[PDB]
Amino acid sequence: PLHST
Amino acid sequence: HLSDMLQQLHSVNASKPSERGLVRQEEAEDPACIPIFWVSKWVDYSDKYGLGYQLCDNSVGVLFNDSTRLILYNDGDSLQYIERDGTESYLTVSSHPNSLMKKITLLKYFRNYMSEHLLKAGANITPRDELARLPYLRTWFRTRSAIILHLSNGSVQINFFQDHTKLILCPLMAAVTYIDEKRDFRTYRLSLLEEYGCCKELASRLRYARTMVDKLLSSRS
Incomplete structure (x- = not known):
C-alpha cells in the first residue's frame, strides 16, 4: 500500500 | 537509543x-x-516527493526525498524546517522564505489528503503543551x-x-x-x-x- 488505512 | x-x-x-x-x-x-x-496516518509519495505523515496530536510532517524535513504543528500554522545538514529553523505557513514555497505547498497537499481520507490510528486514545518540540x-x-x-x-x-x-x-x-x-x-x-x-x-x-x-x-x- 502507498498510504495507511 | x-x-x-x-x-x-x-x-x-x-x-x-x-x-x-x-x-x-x-x-x-x-x-x-x-x-x-x-x-496516526501516512502517505508514501516517495517516488516523487517523500513520505508524509500525521502524528496522533494532529501535527503533520514530511520527510522529503532530499533528506530535508518540514513539520507543521497542530496549530495549523507554525512550522519547523530541518535542512540536510541538520539546521533547524522556525517559520509559519503565512511567513516563510520564498525558497520554501514548493515544500510548503507539498506539505499542504499531504496534510489535506490525510485529513480528508485516512483513518486515524489510535483514534480513541488520549496520548500521554502542543508547541513543545515534536x-x-x-x-x-x-x-x-x-x-x-x-x-x-x-x-x-x-x-x-x-x-x-x-x-x-x-x-x-x-x-x-x-x-x-x-x-x-x-x-x-x-x-x-x-x-x-x-x-x-x-x-x-x-x-x-x-x-x-x-x-x-x-x-x-
Whole structure:
C-alpha cells in the first residue's frame, strides 16, 4: 500500500 | 537509543514469553508507559516527493526525498524546517522564505489528503503543551509485510499491512504498545512481558521487531 488505512 | 531498544528486544525474546507456562499478559500492561506520540496516518509519495505523515496530536510532517524535513504543528500554522545538514529553523505557513514555497505547498497537499481520507490510528486514545518540540521522522522503510517508522524521540513504530496490527516501541519507557485487529490499544512494559508472558501473536511480532531494529541499526547514515 502507498498510504495507511 | 536504537541500541537500547535492541537490547530490550533481545531480553524479551530470550525469555520465550509465549512458550512457557501460564500466560498472564494483562499483568504486563503499564498505563503509565502509554506513548506521547505515534504515527496516526501516512502517505508514501516517495517516488516523487517523500513520505508524509500525521502524528496522533494532529501535527503533520514530511520527510522529503532530499533528506530535508518540514513539520507543521497542530496549530495549523507554525512550522519547523530541518535542512540536510541538520539546521533547524522556525517559520509559519503565512511567513516563510520564498525558497520554501514548493515544500510548503507539498506539505499542504499531504496534510489535506490525510485529513480528508485516512483513518486515524489510535483514534480513541488520549496520548500521554502542543508547541513543545515534536519528534520528527528520522527514517523509514517498507518490507513486503510492514512499514517501519523511526521517530527522533527514539520510538519505532511498525505497521503490518495485511492484518492492520501495529507496534509502537519506546526505548525510554522500555515499553511496547500493541494495536490488535480489533483496534484495542494496550501498552506493556517489556520487562513485565518477560515476567508474565504473552500470546504467540505478540511474541511473533516482537521477534519481527528485533529484526527490524537490526535493519535500522545496520543502515543508519
